[PDB]
Amino acid sequence: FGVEPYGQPKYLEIAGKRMAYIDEGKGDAIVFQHGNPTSSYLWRNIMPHLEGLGRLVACDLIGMGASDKLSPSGPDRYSYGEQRDFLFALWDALDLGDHVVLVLHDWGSALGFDWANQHRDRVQGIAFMEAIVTPMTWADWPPAVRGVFQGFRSPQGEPMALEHNIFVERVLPGAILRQLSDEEMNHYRRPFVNGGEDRRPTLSWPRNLPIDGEPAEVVALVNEYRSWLEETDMPKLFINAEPGAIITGRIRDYVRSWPNQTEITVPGVHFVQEDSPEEIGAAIAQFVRRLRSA
């Protein structure tokens, strides 16, 4: 468990806002996308396993990591669609090519599965873990954090996230089996040290989760892309977690139904990269070698 970020930070302005990203190596792209409340930092111990297998790209979502904050910020900002507009523009700017392997977690999986479904001819394979794969009910959601996420999805969410930073301070470490070092935790806290709107992305994201049919637009998006995943012969690598968090139970059964997929299981809850980076990295490398090595 290295504490240092991978690679050098780079920035490009997208719609007048700086977006930060890692871009190392050469060849066909391997694109790692984080979710909430993380950044490219999440992949620092995984990316080294793919050196020499492609061009390794990991972007920080708008409002997250080293990327700029939107202003004026408020409850109408950092929706799925807004996040998608920024990210997909950054990916276009980076000229990723047409043999992309996506490596996806959490909201990074909704964004990446959506991108792949819109660019089917440019995606070579998808590796995913603890991903958003189907509309949910609360029965699918980890029991220990049902009240907290229902809380986020109410007016209580503003104090919880913007004042108390509960996503970063409580949800993130609660969903890692090991204890992070102070140094690692400081990297996850850095984008969100200031109280108030700086923390808005951490609150907007849970409000987009497709749970009991709301928000309908996200439910519809996920139904669309999963309808493709269910039938496509695109190669897939499912990294299961034990105990896991959002892919457990019937959702885990469902993902296992998808075609042209292999899996592994690693120890972890939600932020599996922080419990099992060597096993994850090794599996993705083996996947990519099978797809590419000759």
Ligand SMILES: [Cl-]
């Ligand atoms: Cl979330």
